[PDB]
Design a protein around this nucleic acid. Structure first.
Ligand SMILES: [Mg+2]
Ligand SMILES: [Mg+2]
Ligand SMILES: [Mg+2]
Ligand SMILES: [Mg+2]
Ligand SMILES: [Mg+2]
Ligand SMILES: [Mg+2]
Ligand SMILES: [Mg+2]
Ligand SMILES: [Mg+2]
Ligand SMILES: [Mg+2]
Ligand SMILES: [Mg+2]
Ligand SMILES: [Mg+2]
Ligand SMILES: [Mg+2]
Ligand SMILES: [Mg+2]
Ligand SMILES: [Mg+2]
Ligand SMILES: [Mg+2]
Ligand SMILES: [Mg+2]
Ligand SMILES: [Mg+2]
Ligand SMILES: [Mg+2]
Ligand SMILES: [Mg+2]
Ligand SMILES: [Mg+2]
Ligand SMILES: [Mg+2]
Ligand SMILES: [Mg+2]
Ligand SMILES: [Mg+2]
Ligand SMILES: [Mg+2]
Ligand SMILES: [Mg+2]
Ligand SMILES: [Mg+2]
Ligand SMILES: [Mg+2]
Ligand SMILES: [Mg+2]
Ligand SMILES: [Mg+2]
Ligand SMILES: [Mg+2]
Ligand SMILES: [Mg+2]
Ligand SMILES: [Mg+2]
Ligand SMILES: [Mg+2]
Ligand SMILES: [Mg+2]
Ligand SMILES: [Mg+2]
Ligand SMILES: [Mg+2]
Ligand SMILES: [Mg+2]
Ligand SMILES: [Mg+2]
Ligand SMILES: [Mg+2]
Ligand SMILES: [Mg+2]
Ligand SMILES: [Mg+2]
Ligand SMILES: [Mg+2]
Ligand SMILES: [Mg+2]
Ligand SMILES: [Mg+2]
Ligand SMILES: [Mg+2]
Ligand SMILES: [Mg+2]
Ligand SMILES: [Mg+2]
Ligand SMILES: [Mg+2]
Lengths: 46, 57, 112, 237, 146, 98
RNA sequence: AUACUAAAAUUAAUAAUUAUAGGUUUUAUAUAUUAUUUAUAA
RNA sequence: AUAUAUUUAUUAAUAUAUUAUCUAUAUUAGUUUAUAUUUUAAUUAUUAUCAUAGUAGAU
RNA sequence: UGACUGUUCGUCAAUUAAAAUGUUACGUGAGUUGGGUUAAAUACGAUGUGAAUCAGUAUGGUUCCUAUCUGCUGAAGGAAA
RNA sequence: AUAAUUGAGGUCCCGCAUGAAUGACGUAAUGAUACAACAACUGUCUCCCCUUUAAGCUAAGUGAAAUUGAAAUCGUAGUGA
RNA sequence: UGCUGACAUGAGUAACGAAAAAAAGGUAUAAACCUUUUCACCUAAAACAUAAGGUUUAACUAUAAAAGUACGGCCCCUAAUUAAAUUGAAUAUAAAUAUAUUUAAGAUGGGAUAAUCUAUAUUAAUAUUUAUCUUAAAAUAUAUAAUUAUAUUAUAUAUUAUAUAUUUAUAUAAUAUAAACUAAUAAAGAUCAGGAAAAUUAAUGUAUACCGUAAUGUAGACCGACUCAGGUAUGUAAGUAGAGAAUAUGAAGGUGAAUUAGAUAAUUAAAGGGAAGGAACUCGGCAAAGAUAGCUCAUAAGUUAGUCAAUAAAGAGUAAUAAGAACAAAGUUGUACAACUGUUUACU
């Protein structure tokens, strides 16, 4: 069937699995949070 | 013809200027699921009741 | 089904400006309006003369505007407190500027 | 099915409805502006409708009139503003053309519209009433308005009338009474001269209109050979 | 489906005239009732008082102060910290709310100007800032005193 | 021009960046403002930043109210009274004789 | 006659001759009731 | 029912024009229908649109 | 011209005066079809310890193009007549 | 079985190279599976014809693509990476 | 087939993306915007309310109004599940960390009061899914307390007249169409045996927090590169007719489109009809054509006994005897493979 519509939005899932606390509350999540910060990125997380 | 002063296609959107951009902006009250609750630091008074109400302290 | 070599300046020009059919023709069928007095196309009608007569019809067979009795009896103060001013959007504001995308016909030159 | 009439790039149902709407709108108003192709077809159906009414008015066979009255109804939408159309047609439109053998409508070409270069033409009913019960100019009779304006133009410019203006006036005068033609021309004169901000002298205009109509109604056929031909009719030896 | 073999359904039962309950309503609306033009509400029926508290949101009952009416900058100066030190708590309290009241008036004028006219005169904004300076100077004096 | 921005401070980072443009690239913006203003509120003097705007009266060598003699201009040798500061181009607005 | 072209017919309104398309009239075709009948008077 | 002329005495009637053939309650909760109740809430004639050109017979 | 076969071929039936032999990229897929042939799936016989394989068998199974030049079919304009 | 059948069904068996849970054999029903036969039906065909709509064509507005060493870009025979 | 920028050719060519429009006036500025009328399309939707989503795109800056009584979130409670959290020494492990127990979080779920409108706080004491069958009786029609047939099996609130505390409530008795449909107990068939968690009185008390609310939401306002014929959850979805949410019309609503106007060449696509043949076509009946009820009867061989076969083919009853909407409805047989319903190669 037709494809391309893989991203079906949902604020709950988007925030729960890519949000700031979804990464600030884990070792691996924190590591990528600080890596983006060191690179100088404005938007640390979702 | 949504805009009578634009007879031909010039790339103009149906509304707004750009269809894309940043999505990592902080959440606000008007947007989210029906179970979302942002708040406006405008209520620190009282205690929610067990049934689902409020009691002003 | 694709061009095998870039078409040179010569071939392109003689293909488009070469034949007599592709080039537009002089307008020789112009006459003098019996009424307007100005130029007009043959076997046609003078748009200005037609336009002004249509104007005469419009002003002599126009329907009176419906102005309800209630409104004209309101003072300026009651109109303001009851029908306040409102702001228009970009689309609405642009639509009212009809002189930027609508333009009237041009009066034809006079023939002697 | 091929060659009977224009298809107008529409199906049979859509095409038929368009023509009926156009003919009915031509009746409700007096002159309408539309594309040349639409105007010609609307002219055809409109003329046939009037002829049916004339035959119904004139006929003495009850069956003939009964079925004609029905056929006219089939080619109209009697709703909205045209609810009273049939009575209007039988009382006003039909009696205007009782003595005219065809040609109840005329199509005059206008300049194409700039948007798409679509040819445009005006469809109007011949012999439309210039005046009204309210003594005010109403819609219709575009040709008559233009003809009078040309007469005004010649008068204001101090030049003789062109043979074509006189010929067109002659065509208008054939089916119209002398007094009625004089009265309507005078009314158009007053309205136009007012619009162009020109002096309007009642007595002078009356004399000029009398002079014009006398020329129109005069019977002077022999005008000799205008041009000395380079060819001569010689009997065959 | 409605085939050609279908037969009309029997008519619904009808209650005999001798058993039909009379309706609880016999009379109804009036059939001589005509449509009248709407009647607008009129302010001539009102008595909006001249002492109405909302008038404190305006300056001398004016829609928007003009240049001449606004206090000029040369003639004015915000309080100084030493000056506030010679003031009692009640007086400083009184000054605070007087500052706030005019702050509301100026805010109303700024918003009207910057949301309708769009001008960047910001004369009202500067006046509000000067009041804001005094307000925090009052706050500093109280803390130092305590 | 209804934006409700004056009532809040949203986009602090973007506003700071726009208002703290690199000094090397000011000529980029100076051209923009100049080409987009009428001639009757534009001066041919460069602007001054808050850090380059004189505040002390010492730097303001001539406070308004004292006669001055104008050099280097079409009004050479004129005598005039400075009437007001400018606070944007860091200049003096002179009277009719100027 | 024809994709657009091109070809061909008419553009008469006068001292006399000329119908290109639409409309109108006549005749005819088609459709389908009609002698139990259509128009008239005596 | 409204409006304009005439008759009669602003009532009633004739002529003309325009408008409409509604609505509301009861039959045990909701919807549809039916009947009774309230009002003035009509029958005929000829059309029209949709259903593959709705479909068949002709042409 | 038919029946059989993916078939060109070939056998057969009924006709004709005859049902000739070749070349044209065993003419012709930017003209059509695609039954055989081959790729992914599957099974049978044989080979191999197997993974898999077959001058084997069987069912199923994706192509596209708006024509610049040459050439050709029709129709025009310019021209030196 | 057809006018005629390399296809289908029944039967015979030097089974190149079947065979019993890599199950053997015969059924009823089921199957958008594959092959074959009969009745009706038809534009599949003999043999194509007429009609309707959207394109194709013309006029107005907007306006891509693969491709492109440079081109002043004919036929035949011969020659030649 | 070098990287980046600018500009050419294809070329003013293909295309402008399911489509009905017309006149008059705003406006001697309109095919494209607004209004009026006519016509048409969608109408168990292209309508009305919503959920999620989203550059607020809305009828807009003077802008989306909640104590609760069908108003949701918020709050109490938990499921699946999650947790740098808790347990000389909980257990294990090169680190990271994993495991078990607690605690906390987590809706897609549960949470008394209510138009005769209602009161949530503090203190003290003690329910998987599924049907309403048969008999009976009342009442009715033909017949004679017996018999045949028949709507009904239970509630939903109005009127009249009586008895109780005294015109507020209850009770009694009588009257009052049919077809669907709704929530509540009732009764009962099968195995596939059908969630978790958070008390009553007595007194006192309630000045009612915060957030959501526009419009689009079978789409020009979300996911699809596009104002993309694709994907997207829920409830009504007028009537007429029907077994039906099928099919036909359409009351009301919405709507008729960033392409228009002419002739419709050859040719292409989607449809209608076609004489005489009727598979001769073709690898191959691919495609197309073919329906003599849709209700009630009747219905063979074989067979695993299952109207499996079977909606059997042919056939009959109901006006049809020349036809006249749409939808449902498209034969029989032999063989190979597999018991059957199902799953598979998103995109050969
Ligand atoms: Mg993507
Ligand atoms: Mg997940
Ligand atoms: Mg939302
Ligand atoms: Mg139709
Ligand atoms: Mg017709
Ligand atoms: Mg002439
Ligand atoms: Mg002729
Ligand atoms: Mg003649
Ligand atoms: Mg003619
Ligand atoms: Mg319809
Ligand atoms: Mg070959
Ligand atoms: Mg060959
Ligand atoms: Mg094997
Ligand atoms: Mg297959
Ligand atoms: Mg054989
Ligand atoms: Mg065969
Ligand atoms: Mg065999
Ligand atoms: Mg074995
Ligand atoms: Mg079997
Ligand atoms: Mg073009
Ligand atoms: Mg290079
Ligand atoms: Mg081309
Ligand atoms: Mg082309
Ligand atoms: Mg095109
Ligand atoms: Mg207009
Ligand atoms: Mg349906
Ligand atoms: Mg319905
Ligand atoms: Mg909606
Ligand atoms: Mg919890
Ligand atoms: Mg929930
Ligand atoms: Mg909403
Ligand atoms: Mg809403
Ligand atoms: Mg879409
Ligand atoms: Mg999007
Ligand atoms: Mg409707
Ligand atoms: Mg809508
Ligand atoms: Mg479109
Ligand atoms: Mg045939
Ligand atoms: Mg036949
Ligand atoms: Mg064959
Ligand atoms: Mg053959
Ligand atoms: Mg088939
Ligand atoms: Mg048997
Ligand atoms: Mg079917
Ligand atoms: Mg066998
Ligand atoms: Mg199977
Ligand atoms: Mg299956
Ligand atoms: Mg597949």
């Amino acid at each position: 069937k037709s494809r391309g519509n893989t991203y079906q939005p949902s604020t709950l899932k988007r925030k729960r699995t890519f949000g700031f606390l979804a990464r600030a509350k884990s070792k691996q999540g924190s590591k990528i949070l600080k890596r983006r910060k060191l690179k100088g990125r404005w938007f640390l997380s979702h | 013809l949504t805009r009578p002063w634009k007879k031909y296609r010039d790339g103009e959107l149906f509304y707004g200027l750009s269809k894309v951009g940043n999505k990592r902006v902080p959440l606000t009250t008007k947007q989210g699921n029906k179970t979302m609750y942002k708040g406006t630091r405008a209520s620190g008074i009282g205690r929610h009741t067990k049934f689902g109400g409020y009691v002003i302290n | 089904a694709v061009p095998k070599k870039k078409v040179s300046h010569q071939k392109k020009r003689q293909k488009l400006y070469g034949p007599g059919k592709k080039q537009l023709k002089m307008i020789h069928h112009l006459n003098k309006c019996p009424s307007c007095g100005h130029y007009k196309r043959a076997n046609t009608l003078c748009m200005y003369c037609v336009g002004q007569i249509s104007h005469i019809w419009k002003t002599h067979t126009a329907k009176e505007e419906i102005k309800p009795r209630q409104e004209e009896e309101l003072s300026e103060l009651d109109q303001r407190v009851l029908y306040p001013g409102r702001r228009d959007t970009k689309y609405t504001k642009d639509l009212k500027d009809k002189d930027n995308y609508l333009e009237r016909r041009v009066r034809t030159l006079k023939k002697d | 099915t091929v060659g009977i009439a224009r298809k107008l790039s529409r199906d049979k149902a859509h095409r038929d409805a368009l023509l009926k709407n156009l003919a009915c709108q031509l009746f409700q108003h007096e002159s309408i502006v539309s594309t040349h192709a639409k105007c010609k077809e609307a002219s055809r159906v409109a003329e046939r409708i009037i002829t049916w009414t004339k035959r119904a008015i004139t006929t003495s066979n009850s069956v003939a009139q009964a079925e004609l009255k029905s056929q006219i109804q089939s080619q109209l939408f009697l709703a909205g503003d045209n609810r009273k159309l049939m009575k209007r047609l039988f009382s006003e439109i039909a009696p205007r053309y009782l003595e005219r053998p065809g040609g109840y409508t005329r199509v005059l070409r206008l300049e194409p519209r700039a948007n798409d270069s679509a040819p445009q033409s005006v469809l109007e009913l011949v012999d439309s009433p210039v005046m009204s019960e309210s003594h005010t100019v109403n819609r219709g009779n575009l040709k008559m308005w233009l003809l009078v304006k040309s007469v005004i133009n010649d008068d204001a410019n101090q030049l003789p009338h062109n043979p074509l203006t006189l010929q067109n006036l002659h065509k208008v005068a054939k089916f119209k009474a002398e007094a009625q033609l004089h009265g309507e021309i005078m009314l158009i004169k007053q309205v136009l001269l007012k619009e162009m901000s020109l002096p309007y002298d009642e007595a002078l205009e009356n004399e000029r209109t009398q002079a014009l109509l006398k020329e129109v109604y005069s019977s002077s056929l022999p005008k000799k050979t205008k041009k000395p031909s380079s060819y001569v009719m010689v009997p065959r030896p | 489906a409605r085939t050609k073999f279908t037969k009309p359904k029997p008519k619904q039962p009808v209650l005999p005239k001798d058993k039909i309950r009379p309706p609880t309503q016999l009379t109804h609306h009036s059939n001589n009732l005509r449509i009248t033009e709407p009647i607008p509400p009129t302010t001539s029926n009102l008595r909006c008082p001249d002492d109405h508290p909302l008038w404190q949101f305006f300056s001398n009952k004016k829609f928007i102060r003009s240049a001449d009416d606004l206090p000029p900058s040369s003639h004015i100066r915000p309080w100084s910290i030493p000056e506030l030190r010679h003031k009692s708590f009640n007086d400083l309290h009184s000054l605070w709310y007087n500052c706030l009241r005019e702050q509301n008036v100026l805010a109303r004028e700024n918003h009207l100007l910057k949301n309708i006219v769009g001008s960047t005169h910001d004369e009202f904004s500067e006046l509000s800032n000067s009041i804001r300076t005094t307000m925090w100077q009052i706050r500093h004096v109280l803390n130092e005193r305590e | 021009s209804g934006s409700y921005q004056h009532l809040s401070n949203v986009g602090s980072r973007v506003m700071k960046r726009l208002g703290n443009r690199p000094k090397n690239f000011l000529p980029h913006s100076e051209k923009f403002i100049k080409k987009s203003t009428p001639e009757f509120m534009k001066s041919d003097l460069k602007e001054v930043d808050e850090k380059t705007s004189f505040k002390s009266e010492k730097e303001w060598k001539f406070i308004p109210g004292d006669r001055v003699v104008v050099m280097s201009g079409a009004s050479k040798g004129n005598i005039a009274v400075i009437k007001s500061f400018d606070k944007r181009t860091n200049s003096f607005i002179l009277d009719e004789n100027g």
